[PDB]
Symmetry: D2
Subunit: 267 residues, 4 copies
Amino acid sequence: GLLEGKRILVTGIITDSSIAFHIAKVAQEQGAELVLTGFDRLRLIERITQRLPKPAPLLELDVQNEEHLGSLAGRISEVIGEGNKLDGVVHSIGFMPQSGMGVNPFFDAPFADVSKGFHISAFSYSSLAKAVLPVMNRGGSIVGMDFDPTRAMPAYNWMTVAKSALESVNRFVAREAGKVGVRSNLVAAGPIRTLAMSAIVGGALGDEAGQQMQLLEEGWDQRAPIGWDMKDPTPVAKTVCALLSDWLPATTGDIIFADGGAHTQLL
Amino acid sequence: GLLEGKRILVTGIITDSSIAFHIAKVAQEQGAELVLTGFDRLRLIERITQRLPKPAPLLELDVQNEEHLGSLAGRISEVIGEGNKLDGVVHSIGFMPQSGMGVNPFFDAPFADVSKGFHISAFSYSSLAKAVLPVMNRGGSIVGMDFDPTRAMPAYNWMTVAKSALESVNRFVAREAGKVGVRSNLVAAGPIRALGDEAGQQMQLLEEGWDQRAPIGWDMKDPTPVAKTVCALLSDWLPATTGDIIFADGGAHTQLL
Amino acid sequence: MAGLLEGKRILVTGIITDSSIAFHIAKVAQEQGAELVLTGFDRLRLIERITQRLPKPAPLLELDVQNEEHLGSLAGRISEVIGEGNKLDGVVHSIGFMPQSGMGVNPFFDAPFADVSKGFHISAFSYSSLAKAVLPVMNRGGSIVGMDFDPTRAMPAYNWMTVAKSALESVNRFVAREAGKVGVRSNLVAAGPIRALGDEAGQQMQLLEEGWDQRAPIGWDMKDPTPVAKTVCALLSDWLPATTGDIIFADGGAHTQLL
Amino acid sequence: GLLEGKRILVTGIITDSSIAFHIAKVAQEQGAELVLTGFDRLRLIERITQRLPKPAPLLELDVQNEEHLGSLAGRISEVIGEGNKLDGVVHSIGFMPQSGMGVNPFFDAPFADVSKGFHISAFSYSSLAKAVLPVMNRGGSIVGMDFDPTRAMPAYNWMTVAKSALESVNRFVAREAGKVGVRSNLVAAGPIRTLAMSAIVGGALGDEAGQQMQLLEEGWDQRAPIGWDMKDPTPVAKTVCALLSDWLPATTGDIIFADGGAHTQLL
């Protein structure tokens, strides 16, 4: 197994289509022992995580809660055994209030909303690292999820800005984590299609992206030299696990693209 | 002159060594008609602006105050005349609480501090653009100030994160401004200069690298090259540049050593 | 009413027709008060007739940028034009050539090395050659500007010319090092694209090039060379005095947007 | 093994200090079956490759020789078995005549020298791909070696230009290789110290880098959040094998940095 004997904390599992779910699934298939986090309705998280290959303990973590963050290392140690430390941490937490996205005018997003999206999506990558580094092994690896924000694009709007900030945070976290031998990297994934139910009785599932976002996302498979399957999270999950492994041991503060090569081409 | 007849709003004048002061000075030397803004130390700013080549009116603007922002377009029109519009706007406001700029470890900066610095240094570029675009002419130019955040650096810490955010914001402001024919760009400037302390010492050592790297050298005591570059972007001579970042750093960022 | 380049002496390469971007660079420069020296090699008689359509007279020197004798004599021949006590303030490299095998008339892999090397020579290496030849007669504070087409991403048809432009960007950063020793700046302008027997490569390029106006926040007019010409003149001026080794985009903002 | 059952062609083994030697070593340790190339003193290359963990056939390949390139596929099929194809190809070929490097003035490099370095160091990445793609499996991987040329630097001079060209070539090779399901990527390695002998009777080993290049290379360990060991090729060799594996399956046209994180930091 690529991650045999490694102990890995995975944040961000909300549904069975959360990219963190597939990261967790591949890591377990590759021999890792997981610790999972959730915040709201832990019982509902427990139901999803019971669909993973192997059991895994669930810890409560609201990344905006300094008390949760302050106690996390000790709660991790309780569950993995006090002599043991983590080898990997996955940050898969991204959120921006809807006023900051979609067809809401970019200029109309209230600061309070954008600040919260910045907190959850970018600042919390630093918060999580600070919280977990005291219980990580030398040579360990922290990986966060990115969506390339180098160029502006329709709909992604202020979430793009939060990802630009996240990329910058990642470089400082790598500086801090490196002092104790830990790597920090982001995976810039191509778009993965997400379904959500209409919030009404009789509701059905349907694509979350609106028209403009869908048109934007369909460009990836057109551009990607090896194509891009928006319904397939597995290549992204494998890439995260590559960074959690010891096979990129000299990469840190960096961004690895799992996007079919789309960002390298222009049509 | 380079900006002959252009009406330009300049934010960020604090002292007569502020880069905004030198931007305003060069712009007036090049024929611009200015409107200035201030908030903190507003009487002091009026005194400072008397040292400019020419007088200019001053409007109060706290870029965190949505009432100040919503009234700004009407207040500008009152100053310049209701049938006239601005051709240029300069965003030269950067603030990050010291806890985000190296007086403590990176990890110790509290969110409330970093959020405020993000608000002032990144979000408000969008706020100001939203406020001014209704009174800007087609072909106009919004320019903000940047400090290259592509790589992490000693001490600059969360201000560098804010500037990465600002660069992203600029690309979206360009999208919105272009709908009415207005450009939006940043200038990535090189650094401009007993109780001294660690964060200041770290920044000093980092900043001395620019002159070492810059093929044409870098004078940390000379704001004029940066001010001239801003005026270039305010002029009609970069009419197809938007969403972009122009480096005024001696070429330091293009060289490894 | 001072012009942007008032009193400056500027050498301009690359004028082939009155549609050449170099023609428009020269035209705007003269409108802004510059005194020009022009160069040509192929179709010299044609170039002379073309250069007479510029606003003001300008002498024409022969320069094959692959000819080391032409390069080596260039500084002395410039001094004859402008006076031994005078120097140039600006130099424009607007020479790009890649044999058609490197620009999409056949698949990328089929381009022969000899063709690609020739295009590398003319489109990338000669930026360094020209700088070497002109710098001894350039003033401190002067400016060398070359023409770029953003090669950060692979594109249809442009193929090995894109590779040459990647190389050119790297050359520019090294020319900046050498030029900086005598106070001279070196930069590239990355321009957006400027416009029955139509053929495949041209069709691919047209479809690709129409995307600039779609992406550009301020639009992009492929029929209008003036914004690019002005941007070159901005770099030749004293208004970007701390920019060197760099790439300035004159593309409507298209490269900053995905859609 | 990370590369169990994979057939991989490795170019560029000159000495037992060539990065390609260490790539070949790790690939064999990870279960790969190799085919090796050489051009100069094939008997001397056979002697170097006998120190690899396992035997591997050696094929002659001058990448400037179109007859060598045109026959390469058939000569590969002969040695790996007529029904078989390659899963991986490593390009580790870089050369610039000395007039193009060091304390030679940048402006004094003759074009014929720079053209030759461009041919060997950049054009030949396309030539090798063209020659080997007919005998590569879908899902295969081509990996070339890079030294980050994003900024100019002392000494590296025209080789920097060649690497800039190589990066561009890699993005076009990715477009072409992707049509048959093959990825193409570069590894941008930190500097690896190289010793060479003075060309004199009684000669000794010493660093090939001149003063300015040594000062440049020494910055990596200072900048790198996890440090950078110029004497250790292994992290770079491992990163190449990561790209040859199936664990970065959606990465193509790209550049993976194995440099300790140094390019993400500024002092």
